[PDB]
Design a binder for this molecule. Structure first.
Ligand SMILES: Nc1ncnc2c1ncn2[C@@H]1O[C@H](COP(=O)(O)OP(=O)(O)OP(=O)(O)O)[C@@H](O)[C@H]1O
Ligand SMILES: Nc1ncnc2c1ncn2[C@@H]1O[C@H](COP(=O)(O)OP(=O)(O)O)[C@@H](O)[C@H]1O
Ligand SMILES: [Mg+2]
Ligand SMILES: [Mg+2]
Lengths: 365, 177, 210, 281, 277, 70, 52, 105
């Protein structure tokens, strides 16, 4: 069954499973902590179970940030109201020695597995940087007298990672919806730790730095993010056909980009110009403001429902919104707001003056 | 009767209403001519501007004092403040004079205008100097042009133009000065 | 463990709570990058430790835009909404105008097609990137930066063309009555009385571009 | 285009999430559809070896093989990611031994080693912990002999030995379409054919994402359907002509009314070879 | 994967020398075809100082010509003409006037049909293959005279220099079908001239406007060819810039892959040797 | 010829050959700079076409025929 | 590349060498046609980046 | 190079002069120290160089300075290995350089 996240690119192209292992793959500054915080804010309130946040090898400042914002929103309650808390935090942050960061994910797993196996209910496990588990065992493995494997890693990368990852499942007696941030070491998706952890997930959302440098946030590579839920027998043929058509347009633009960078858009076919215009519109439309990003972006965030996502992306596919410019799609919620922003950008094409006199800022006001 | 007074200026004003406003006004052939017909002047006594043109050349643009034009009624001449004229030219010798020296261009025909401001625009297709024609091939071709005489008035009109151009070329090449 | 080397170093740069005294420690790690490759090992290590980045480009530094701050890549998310309030009132328009300047320089790297509204955002961006560049070993107080970017994100400098802005902002700092710097420092932000006196004081300023 | 005979080993090589398992699951489900229609002697019994996968990934396949009915003929040898590294190294050999029963007694087998590239990582782990000295990328020297010992057991036996057969489908995962890797170039050198699946063809709509220019079958026209031997000879003859003309006509220079024919016909054939997920034709 | 990058550097470098060749080719063709463009610029002037410039006149029937290029690396020249086609073709529209649109050049055949497909009648192409001659423009004028409108519009790019080609609409009216009807003011301005024809004035203007159409069409497709060559010289100037910056990025990334290859092969060799000693 | 150098150089050349090789290598440097544009023959340039034609002459000069040293 | 064109045997004509390709071994009528075929196949490859 | 440095340091520290040192191909100094680091059985660092590359280079270059007595000014020819300025031997040398004078053909 699908897990609605309120994120356009996530719900459209690589939808999440409600008892699935979800991975966010990223390269130091592309936004997987901001994505994992937005997934916390969207999912972990409607989902009525308990949460576990296992912080492995991340900033201590971010653990303090999440702890204080959970006390503010009442997810964590202090004192005698402590039993009405919904989240438990396990922290092995990046000041810890390598032995502590190599076992703290197992501590957070143990806290999640009690609620799954004994309380018998749904858990949300969020693990910020499960890569730091592998990196910590790679720091340790040098001094244990092991011959190193590929790039520099332990010979037991696959089996340590698989033994940790195969505990994070939903069984018949309870559920664990897992979201793991996965770090990629030098924007290298072929590094052995990301390449090993790709096969453990049901939905792998790969964040790209080239998408982030175009201002598109969340920086989700739509042609590199996959799910097992993108299957018409699971999500319905309407959703699946819209998602595959969006991916077909984006892949066609990716094949055109080598020509466009050299020969310009003046050498393209009219069919090619149509797919480049539509693909730029659906690239900007996949971006979305986050509610957790509004404290530093200033733009309030939007939760886009899945039906609105499917309908809006179908309309931009068929050519219903070729009247609108490219920047009307950038950082809006759904297709009502594209038309609102497209009226507003057009409206502001005239109104640029008449702040000349009639002020409230003369000397005796 | 002239209820659509167009121009570059009217098209500029109306074109800012139906085209998108960022598009600059398309240029017009008026914008590259400093010389008009109704703009009085450009005379200065005895010599007048002779714009002897060609599709593939500009044979003369300096001011000359007398031009012999081979119109269809016959050869006429243009001095400085001549009457306005739109003269169709038969194939003949356009004589440009600046004094005692004369350059003789034998042209193929095509119109020659004299405007109210004294500018003259000779406008012919093939305007050869009479130096570069041979006197042999003209009667050599007119002997055949006096032979193929069909009932096809397209081909017969082409034969009429052929014998008339060739006859004028012959009568201009025996009569050198 | 070369990640752990820098992580256990930079994690000691903290802001302590009031029960621990309330002291702080601000870190500026410096990482030299080879040919702009941000995807290096130690670079992407320290990027995933620190709270932001200040990217300094060779293509902006060779052109004389100094400090050569890559505004599209530089970021500071923990210090944001924790900065000077008058500078926060002024600088969102500056970030947005440099954003649109980057957009229209990403569209037209050669100049032949001028919209004359794209020429406006080009002229405003060229004014602002001349405003932000400064000289060495002379830091400015924050109220003299607030007033200097207030005079640029608004009008008050479009008379000055593109060259004399370095003298224009010095003329603005010099000819503005220095009480408004004390009010801006003491109050923290531009009050509407101070906005009135500041709009008034930026009109009796003799700009060198005339 | 790349037909497969009985006793042939065929590599399904591709990048990370192409249709590699989906090609191999469709080969197993299709044998259920053929086993109901053929006589008892020419029935193909399938074995799916799942090396290094999730345990719930293989629980989704037992559920798929049950509700199709292919589990009547299927053995699943499941050495998941939480199993020990010698259990994942040895599971392709256990599955080959379970499938060699049908080869040795005159029946026909179909073995699918899903991620031999995950068996060699399990082999590299033991070899590096038994302190055997590492070679390329860290792999032991005998990692070619690891896979050629195993894939050469897929054979079509002589009629003296029963006429039995065993058809292998090793799966190899590449990293960025880099088939020049160590384990990739070994199994390309061992197996007869190659089904190369491309991630850029996957997103253009072409699913199965088969690179028709790189996919081979060394048995070839010897063991395909005679009803499609005379049709799919023309099909690869036209798709070879489709490929180079579309490299030119995406620039948008000029078109030639017969060059226009081959990139309009090859689009009829490219859409013809598309297919849905679990419906073998 | 380290040989995909070396062959991509090979592709980008061969593209970058191809476009640098085509830039010099366009620059070579621009100078030896400017020697024919400003020669033919003179003959357009007597017809404009005789007949004047009447673009926005209420024609019953109008044939508009957008003369464009044949080859396609010109860089947004033909699209600018395709947009000025409709920008000047909607400014004619005042009473529901008939319009025939005609394109000279293969790249106008593909581009006007997207915008005006029912009003398309003729495509003249292969015109700049050998050269442009006046007999050729005469035949194109003949086939534009087969159906005989009241006005002609020619859209092209006036070759100012190698930088600017600001586009031009030149207008040619049928002899007294509208042209002398646009000349009569308190009398007429055409009646100053003594018609020295064989037959009447209605036939000397009939010949004179076909000669004006031939001259304007010849000069239009000559100026458009020279502006095409200069636009291609400016278009392949940006192509070598792009194929040099892409080459520089690819060379930097190849240097990274070369260094990483030597380091990883060295770490493999050291780990092999240290497991024996 | 672009990648083959001699750090000793023309101090150890045959004089007389030094008279002609010094302009031969300059003509071949100009030809190498204008090379790979000889596929543009219909697209002629009339100043680089001379050095392109002469470079095609001179590369045909320096060909030899296998154990017939000169 | 020769095999993906369908040219079978996919022998690279430029890259295949022999020590029997001297004119004093296999004659000049064989040597010069082999070298001419190689030169035509080589400048075709130099043109092929501009045909595409 | 240390022997040339010692000859220059005598003129700096005893004679009190502004000395010029010419290290002809500083890259060959790097390559020689890399060879003696490889021969002493040390694990090579990045691309292939000695693990002590920055300190084996800085031990030479930090003795070239201005003292209170005199100075040593060093003109070092720099070879860039694969026309790659991000190679660690020129990237380590360019940290020490105060000027480049590129001689062009
Ligand atoms: N022929 C097809 N048509 C449509 N979708 C397909 C097809 N084949 C595969 N898919 C989709 O592609 C996704 C990946 O398929 P598959 O599980 O075969 O990947 P894979 O190559 O086995 O990679 P991995 O081993 O990492 O899972 C699946 O979710 C499936 O829905
Ligand atoms: N959705 C978003 N909206 C705006 N900015 C974002 C978004 N996601 C990421 N960013 C920017 O990217 C930076 C790095 O994101 P973060 O998640 O902290 O990095 P990492 O992926 O290394 O954890 C953030 O500081 C933020 O400025
Ligand atoms: Mg993080
Ligand atoms: Mg699989």
């Amino acid at each position: 069954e699908i897990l609605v996240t309120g994120i356009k690119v996530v719900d459209l192209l690589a939808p999440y499973q409600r008892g699935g292992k979800i991975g966010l793959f990223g390269g130091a500054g592309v936004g997987k902590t901001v994505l994992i915080m937005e997934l916390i804010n969207n999912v972990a309130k409607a989902h009525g179970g308990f949460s576990v946040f296992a912080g492995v090898g991340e900033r201590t400042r971010e653990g303090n940030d999440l702890y204080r914002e959970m006390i503010e929103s009442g997810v964590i309650k202090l004192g005698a109201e402590r039993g009405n808390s919904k989240c438990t935090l396990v922290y092995g942050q990046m000041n810890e020695p390598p032995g502590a960061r190599a076992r703290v994910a197992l501590t957070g797993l143990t806290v999640a597995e009690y609620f799954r196996d004994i309380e018998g209910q749904d858990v949300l496990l969020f693990v910020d940087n499960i890569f730091r588990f592998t990196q910590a065992n790679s720091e340790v493995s040098a001094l244990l007298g092991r011959i190193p494997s590929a790039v520099g890693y332990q010979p037991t990368l696959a089996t340590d990672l698989g033994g940790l990852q195969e505990r994070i499942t939903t069984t018949t007696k309870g559920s664990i919806t897992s979201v793991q941030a996965v770090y990629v070491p030098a924007d290298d998706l072929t590094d052995p730790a990301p390449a090993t952890t790709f096969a453990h997930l049901d939905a792998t959302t790969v964040l790209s730095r080239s998408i982030a440098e175009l201002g598109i946030y969340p920086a989700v590579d739509p042609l590199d993010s996959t799910s097992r839920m993108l299957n018409p027998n699971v999500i319905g043929a309407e959703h699946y056909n819209v998602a595959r058509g969006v991916q077909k347009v984006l892949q066609d633009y990716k094949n055109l980009q080598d020509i466009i960078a050299i020969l310009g858009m003046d050498e393209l076919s009219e069919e090619d110009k149509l797919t480049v215009a539509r693909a730029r519109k659906i690239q900007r439309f996949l971006s979305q403001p986050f509610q957790v990003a509004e404290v530093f972006t200033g733009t309030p965030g939007k939760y886009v429902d899945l039906a609105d996502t499917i309908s809006g992306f179908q309309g931009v596919l068929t050519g219903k919104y070729d009247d609108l410019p490219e920047m009307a799609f950038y950082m809006v919620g759904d297709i009502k707001e594209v038309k609102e922003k497209a009226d507003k950008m057009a409206k502001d094409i005239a109104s640029r003056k008449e702040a000349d006199n009639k002020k409230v800022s003369e000397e005796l006001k | 009767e002239a209820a659509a007074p167009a121009g570059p200026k009217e098209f500029t004003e109306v074109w800012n209403k139906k085209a998108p406003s960022t598009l600059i006004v398309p240029e017009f052939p008026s914008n590259y001519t400093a010389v008009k017909a109704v703009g009085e002047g450009q005379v200065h006594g005895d010599a007048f501007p002779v714009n002897f043109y060609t599709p593939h050349s500009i044979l003369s643009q300096a001011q000359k004092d007398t031009v012999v034009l081979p119109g269809v009624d016959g050869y006429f001449g243009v001095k400085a403040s001549h009457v306005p004229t739109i003269a169709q030219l038969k194939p003949g010798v356009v004589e440009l004079h600046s004094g005692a020296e004369s350059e003789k261009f034998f042209v193929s025909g095509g119109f020659a205008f004299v405007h109210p401001n004294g500018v003259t625009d000779i406008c012919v297709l093939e305007a050869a100097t009479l130096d570069q024609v041979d006197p042999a091939a003209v009667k050599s071709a007119l002997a055949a042009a006096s032979a193929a005489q069909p009932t096809d008035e397209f081909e017969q009109a082409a034969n009429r133009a052929a014998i008339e151009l060739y006859s004028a070329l012959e009568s201009a090449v025996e009569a050198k000065a | 463990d070369v990640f752990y080397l820098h992580s256990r170093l930079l994690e000691r740069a903290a802001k302590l709570s009031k029960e621990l005294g309330g002291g702080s420690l601000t870190a500026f790690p410096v990482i030299e990058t080879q040919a702009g490759d941000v995807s290096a090992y130690i670079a992407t290590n320290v990027i995933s430790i620190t709270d932001g980045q200040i990217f300094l480009e060779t293509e902006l530094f060779y052109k004389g835009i100094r400090p050569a701050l890559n505004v599209g890549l530089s970021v500071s998310r923990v210090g944001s909404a924790a900065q000077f309030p008058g500078m926060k009132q002024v600088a969102g328009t500056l970030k947005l105008e440099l954003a649109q300047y980057r957009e229209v320089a990403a569209f037209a790297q050669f100049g032949s097609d001028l919209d004359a509204a794209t020429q406006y955002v080009l002229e405003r961006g060229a004014r602002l990137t001349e405003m932000l560049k400064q000289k060495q070993f002379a830091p400015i107080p924050i109220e003299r930066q607030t007033v200097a970017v207030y005079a640029a994100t608004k009008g008050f400098l479009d008379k000055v063309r593109v060259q004399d802005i370095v003298a224009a902002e010095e003329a603005v700092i010099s000819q503005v009555n220095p009480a408004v710097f004390k009010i801006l420092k003491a109050n923290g932000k531009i009050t509407p009385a101070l906005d009135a006196h500041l709009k008034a004081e930026l009109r009796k300023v003799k700009l060198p571009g005339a | 285009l790349v037909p497969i005979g009985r006793g042939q080993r065929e590599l399904i090589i591709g990048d990370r999430q192409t249709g590699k398992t989906a090609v191999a699951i469709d080969a197993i489900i299709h044998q259920k559809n053929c086993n109901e229609q053929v006589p008892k002697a020419q029935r193909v019994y399938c074995v799916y070896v799942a090396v290094g996968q999730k345990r719930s990934t293989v629980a989704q396949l037992v559920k798929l093989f049950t509700q199709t009915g292919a589990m009547r003929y299927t053995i699943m040898v499941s050495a998941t990611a939480s199993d020990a590294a010698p259990l994942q190294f040895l599971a392709p050999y256990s599955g080959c031994a379970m499938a060699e029963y049908f080869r040795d007694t005159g029946k026909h087998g179909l073995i699918i080693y899903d991620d031999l590239s995950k068996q060699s990582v399990a082999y590299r782990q033991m070899s590096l912990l038994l302190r055997r000295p590492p070679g390329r990328e860290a792999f032991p020297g005998d990692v070619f002999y690891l896979h050629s010992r195993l894939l050469e057991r897929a054979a079509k036996l002589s009629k003296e030995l029963g006429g039995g057969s065993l058809t292998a489908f090793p799966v190899i995962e590449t990293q960025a379409g880099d088939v020049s890797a160590y384990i990739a170039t070994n199994v390309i050198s061992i197996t007869d054919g190659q089904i190369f699946l491309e991630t850029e063809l996957f997103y253009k709509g072409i699913r199965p994402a088969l690179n028709v220019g790189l996919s081979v079958s060394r048995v070839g026209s010897a063991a395909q359907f005679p009803g499609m031997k005379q049709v799919a000879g023309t099909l690869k003859l036209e798709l070879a002509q489709y490929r180079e003309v579309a490299a030119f006509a995406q620039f948008g220079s000029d078109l030639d009314a017969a060059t226009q024919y081959v990139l309009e016909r090859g689009a009829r054939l490219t859409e013809m070879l598309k297919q849905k997920q679990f419906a073998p034709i | 994967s380290n040989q995909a990058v070396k062959q991509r550097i090979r592709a980008i470098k061969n593209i970058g020398k191809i476009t640098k060749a085509m830039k010099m080719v366009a620059a070579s063709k621009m100078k030896n075809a400017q020697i024919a463009v400003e020669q033919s610029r003179g003959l357009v002037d007597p017809f404009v100082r005789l007949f004047g410039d009447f673009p926005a006149v209420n024609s019953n029937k109008s044939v508009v010509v957008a003369v464009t290029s044949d080859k396609g690396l010109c860089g947004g020249l033909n699209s600018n003409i395709t947009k000025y086609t409709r920008a000047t073709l909607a400014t004619t529209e005042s009473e529901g006037k008939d319009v025939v649109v005609v394109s000279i050049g293969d790249k106008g055949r593909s581009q006007l049909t997207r915008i005006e497909s029912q009003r398309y009648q003729l495509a003249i192409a292969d015109t700049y293959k050998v050269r442009v001659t006046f007999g050729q423009a005469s035949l194109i004028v003949e086939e534009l005279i087969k159906h005989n409108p009241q006005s002609y519009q020619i859209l092209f790019n006036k070759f100012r220099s190698a930088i600017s080609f600001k586009p031009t609409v030149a207008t040619i009216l049928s002899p007294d079908l509208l042209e002398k009807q646009l000349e009569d003011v308190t009398g007429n301005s055409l009646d100053a001239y003594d018609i020295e024809a064989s037959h009447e004035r209605s036939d000397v203007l009939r010949d004179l406007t076909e000669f004006h159409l031939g001259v304007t069409l010849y000069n239009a497709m000559l100026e458009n060819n020279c502006s095409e060559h200069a636009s291609r010289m400016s278009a392949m100037e940006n192509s070598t810039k792009s194929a040099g910056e892409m080459l520089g990025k690819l060379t930097l990334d190849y240097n990274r892959k070369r260094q990483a290859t030597i380091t990883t092969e060295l770490i493999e060799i050291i780990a092999g040797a240290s497991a024996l000693m």
